[PDB]
UniProtKB/Swiss-Prot annotation, chain A:
Result for mutant: residue 274 to S: In SG5 mutant
The protein, known as: Glucose-1-phosphate adenylyltransferase
Alphabetically ordered keywords of this record: Allosteric enzyme, ATP-binding, Carbohydrate metabolism, Glycogen biosynthesis, Glycogen metabolism, Nucleotide-binding, Nucleotidyltransferase, Transferase
Alphabetized InterPro entries for the sequence: ADP-Glc_PPase, ADP_Glu_pyroP_CS, GlgC_bac, GlmU/GlgC-like_hexapep, NTP_transferase_dom, Nucleotide-diphossugar_trans, Trimer_LpxA-like_sf
PROSITE patterns per UniProt: ADP_GLC_PYROPHOSPH_1 (PS00808), ADP_GLC_PYROPHOSPH_2 (PS00809), ADP_GLC_PYROPHOSPH_3 (PS00810)
One Pfam family cited in the UniProt record for this chain: NTP_transferase
Amino acid sequence: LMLARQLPLKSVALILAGGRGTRLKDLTNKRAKPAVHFGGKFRIIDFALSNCINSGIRRMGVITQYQSHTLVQHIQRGWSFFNEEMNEFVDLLPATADAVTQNLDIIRAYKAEYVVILAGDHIYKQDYSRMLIDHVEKGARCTVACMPVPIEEASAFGVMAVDENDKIIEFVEKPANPPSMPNDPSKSLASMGIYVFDADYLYELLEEDDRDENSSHDFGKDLIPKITEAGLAYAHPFPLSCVQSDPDAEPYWRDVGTLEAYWKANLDLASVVPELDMYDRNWPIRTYNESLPPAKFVQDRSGSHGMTLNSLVSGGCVISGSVVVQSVLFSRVRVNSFCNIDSAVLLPEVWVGRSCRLRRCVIDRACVIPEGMVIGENAEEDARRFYRSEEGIVLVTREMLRKLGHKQE
Amino acid sequence: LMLARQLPLKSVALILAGAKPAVHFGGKFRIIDFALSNCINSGIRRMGVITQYQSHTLVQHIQRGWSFFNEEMNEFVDLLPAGTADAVTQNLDIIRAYKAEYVVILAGDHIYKQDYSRMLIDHVEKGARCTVACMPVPIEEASAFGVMAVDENDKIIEFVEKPANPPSMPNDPSKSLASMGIYVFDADYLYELLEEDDRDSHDFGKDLIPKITEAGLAYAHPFPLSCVQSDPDAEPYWRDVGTLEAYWKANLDLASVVPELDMYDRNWPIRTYNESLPPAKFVQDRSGSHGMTLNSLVSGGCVISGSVVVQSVLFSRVRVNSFCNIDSAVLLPEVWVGRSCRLRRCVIDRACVIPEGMVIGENAEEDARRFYRSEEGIVLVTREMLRKLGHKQE
Amino acid sequence: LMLARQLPLKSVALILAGNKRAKPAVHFGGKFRIIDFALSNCINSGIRRMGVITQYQSHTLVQHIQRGWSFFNEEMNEFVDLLPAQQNWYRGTADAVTQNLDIIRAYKAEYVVILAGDHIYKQDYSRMLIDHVEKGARCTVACMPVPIEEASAFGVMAVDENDKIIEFVEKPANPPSMPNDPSKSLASMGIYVFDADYLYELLEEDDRDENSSHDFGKDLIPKITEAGLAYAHPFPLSCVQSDPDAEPYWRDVGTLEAYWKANLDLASVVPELDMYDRNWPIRTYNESLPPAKFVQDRSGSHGMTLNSLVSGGCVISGSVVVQSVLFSRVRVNSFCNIDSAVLLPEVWVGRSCRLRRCVIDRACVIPEGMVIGENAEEDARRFYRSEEGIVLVTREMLRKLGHKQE
Amino acid sequence: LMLARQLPLKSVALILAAKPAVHFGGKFRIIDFALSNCINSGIRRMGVITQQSHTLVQHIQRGWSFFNEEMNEFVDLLPAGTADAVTQNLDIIRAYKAEYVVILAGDHIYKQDYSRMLIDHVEKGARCTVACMPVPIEEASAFGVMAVDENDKIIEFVEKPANPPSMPNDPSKSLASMGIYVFDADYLYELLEEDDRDENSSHDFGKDLIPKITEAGLAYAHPFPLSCVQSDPDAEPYWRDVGTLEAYWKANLDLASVVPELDMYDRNWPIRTYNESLPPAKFVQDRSGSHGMTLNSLVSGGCVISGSVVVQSVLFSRVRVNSFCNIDSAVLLPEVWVGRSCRLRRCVIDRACVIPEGMVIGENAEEDARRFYRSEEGIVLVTREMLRKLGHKQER
């Protein structure tokens, strides 16, 4: 049959945004994880949405669960180009499962055959059409995408065990002592929060869930386990649909929970061969295309040139000489003279005063680094002034600088 | 008063093109962007781009970056196909439907910032049927321009188009009073003039402007009255970018520490096609050494492996491989610079593939043989030139 | 000094938006939603920076702004921000602005234009900005004479020879009359122009005071007046209208009768409100709809139409449509008599229906042979019937009567 | 293979060719169908070869310039027999880097799922696939006629033969080419390069390239029913060329009938066009205060009708109809102004016509034929020049 082209059209994807899980702030001091700046020009949610477009699912519902203005604004500036008459749109649904139930009437209006539940706070490339094919072929009422993960990390994920037909036999949510994969147990088998539902089953099921007082109203914590025990939950190996230029590589998926994970994932793009390919013309990522002037590199006050090693400089940046290494500079970052920026991620509109030395850190949006501030060299002092991760990564939010008496306007 | 904002709404701007208007400039722009942008910032949201010839790149640029208007709100960018006035006469039927009280004739092949609303005020206040924007230019060059002589009330006493003996200004002999090819017309008067003129040159300057002057209905508009500039204590910025040297000079100006042209002005922004590009990527060379950048621009999508980039402007997606020394150069989009190249005082055209170890800008004679070399010493490198030398473009 | 061109660009407009669909998001005139007017005015006045403050985050309002008012290129200093508000006797009008005060400060505007997005009118805010500056006021309030009987609902003001506000009172029970004509009062239109800095300071001061109700009219305007910094702006100075002689058009549309009246107004031969004015157009969501399709009824008979509007996607089998407005995708089956009615989108009228002086809500399914508008007592039982005689029919009402809505 | 969806994404559509920019069905322009088909088939990369024709460029600009180029979707305006036009721009087309090329004619009205034709193309392993439809033998001479074997491989092709070969399945019909081709991109490029580079052919697919492919045995046929989209499966495939005036009039009026052959309400295969902001269709009283009558007719946005009688008619956007008018089996294109007391029958009024007061059309056959063009079958066409020679002022 010609089902592959048909299934996306019969499907609707819902992206559960909101639920901030990041220390980073975006100019009002309380951002949501889905709207976190990434890779110089992107926000995390862009990935999920982008996948939908490239997968053939042009009907999306972004659920923003705390009236966030930066996420709504991003959807409005970068994802409001659709012609509703062509069966394509990005609806902004107001306020994990509870939010979906709250908008259940509006969703039924979509009149969708299959529903794609996604988490808009992960960075990955996946062809959802393949997962829909697997859904129909395997014929479950619910299909869940899964992948092997290190045992140490498995506590944050939902762990599952399947049979020969990839039918979900056992599921447990963020267990403290996660089961290892039965065979080749170098790591437990974690779920990716990516679901495909037959629309009718999901509607009925959410109706059932809202009336239970004791249910936690979460897919992983309450809903999915109930789905699993009835034997209607099948598994989808992520490699079956994961999109990647180099076939001989591990599937790329980052939940970007910790500061260290964020710092690592961003700096990856500055390396010679990044694990994540952001140049792939066959699976592009859509975002708000801000009009920015070219990156401007100028001489410092001493008239010296600037040096750069394995770094990214987004539009609107202005760099006076200085040395920038293993760093990612988002849009409109100003770096004044005699700076040493080092293994750092500077979010948009950061202003770095002269004679600064930044190292293994993440400067938050619009921070104003005063003149001659040093970061990343004295562990105790840095931990005192700002936040320092267990591995040694520093986070500098503009509020932290305010507490130290440095005006950020 | 209410006149100031309402005059723009009753006006329509026509941008005559040719392709020069579709020339890359400043890393992310095309020249026409300025003219159009001025209109937007001046309150004129109804534009008519007359393409001398249907240029695929110009039509495409207008389609990708300037086709965002809601026609029901009295805003549009019409693509009108086509002497200079003859092109307007051809689309005269379409233009009448605009139902504009005033028509703004612009040249889409110049780089400048001008508030056309001020020129409209000056036009109405003076009550002329036609107003011409004028700026002093060196007398030596005035032969290329249309020159004018005015009275105390900025009324044009005399006009001559491209005169062999350009008149000097009575009170500033070093230069003359030049017309900028920027006009404001009473729409109905323009219609009458075009109808009468077709039944006859077919150029505004050579034919129409002298006729209007003879009727005493042609007034002048000093450019400083409306020119937009960050530093008031400076000469008005207007570059025709005709010659290679002018193009190279204007582009590299944007790379200097203090450019004469402010491309960071949020009060008079320039609209263009907002390309979706990855950040400019700097990487290590084959030796693992760092790269050096001095007073240069690096647009999105570029990938630069170490090397030294000085006094240069790199447009989008320019690839610069290891061990390169680029100095006072302008690299247009999609240029591919092979390893170990040394480019100096040159302009590399779109998508050139520079092979490995080519040197340019050091041996004048050799450069002149391979490519085009201006009298002042600037080199231009096209895809065709490179094919003549046997270097595959693919 | 070429002020008119500059002031809008230095200004930002704030549109305050207070069962399911919110008042600013009420369908109107076949294709529009009320808020469209306010926004449109801003656009036509030169103010391309707007902030829609939604007290109740209506999915239909956000969705409408998303489909029809998210076409701006932010790099040119133009946008429509969706500002949420998180919710005493008087609704806290100012509180909603106070909540988003940080974002608004980020605009860095010299002047702020406060608007009510639940009124239908055409006004050139640039004229009010010029007058604002000329008077040198810190606050200018748009004012219009209104019938005194109704004036109790409005905020009433008394001005001097220089249009400076001398006295202000919100919703007086015993409304003061105007000196010239005491059958009218001088009412505030809930349209303000503020010096940005002054507004910021005033909101900061107001949020601290517990006594204040955080409403523009009851507390803020009196405070400004007592300082002698509140000037008035005659609406005719800026009201935009095709016919210079007619009276300024401004409709509150709170009452059901007001909605029915305003909608039906567009169906008359000469409506008071000109929706064909190419010089002051109204922007809205341009839905792709097929042309209005008129077909024969089951008997093969023609349809009759008198002073009515038929929006795109409608399908009418014969029937008689009089003094009515049919929104998009309305199906009217055979042998129907529609009279002085307003049918919101996707209404389905079964065969042999007779509707009169009524309002059918979105997507209602009228069964076959239902009569409305003729038996006052029965209509009042079945649905909602206003004191003046107008009927409203919602999907739920038809549900309770045993008629499937699906 | 596993997933068919990828074939469209690997393809680019080229729409050749004033005809494509003709108003149809009240709101659409003909080209809208082709383009729309591409969209609904998964082909979001189109190249419209124009000329320039201002109306076509403008339509593409207002209604088909909403694409995000970074997502591999666009409708670029390519300027320029038929194959020569593609050859002119094949530098740009090669830049597309498409695996398959879909050549379409933008002057036909039809609904077709090109993805199914791509499947058939690959499955048959053809270098070129030509969409084929039975046509009446009398009419088949204007078309390119072909003869195939059991495997739908094209055995014989002839362009516009005067003596069309008959077909076995329906002697009353022959096998006609629909001017819809699917090519392996590289192969197509090779054929164009060699033809412009060497052969002195007419540079037409049917006259030159299709025959060349057939003699090579690399040209297969694709039955239109395999991909034609229609709500009623038990119905005949819809495909109208609209060259003749009568065809235009008929196709337009079909949409006003109770059950149109062409479904313009299909939410599963919608047609995109320029969505102009128009006020609702306004019906008002005539000068006598009397009602208006309507029978099986369409009234687009912006129209204003004062009473009058409108029967079996299509009124495009912003048509003004004054009092005491009787319009019957007529198609009035946008912005027409009909004076008081007119009676129009079986005609097509062109854009922005101003019909003076009391003019009658469609009744006195001779009189109408005298005034302006009248087809042999009895349809009248009214153009603004026609009225100017009759002395009625336009441009008001």
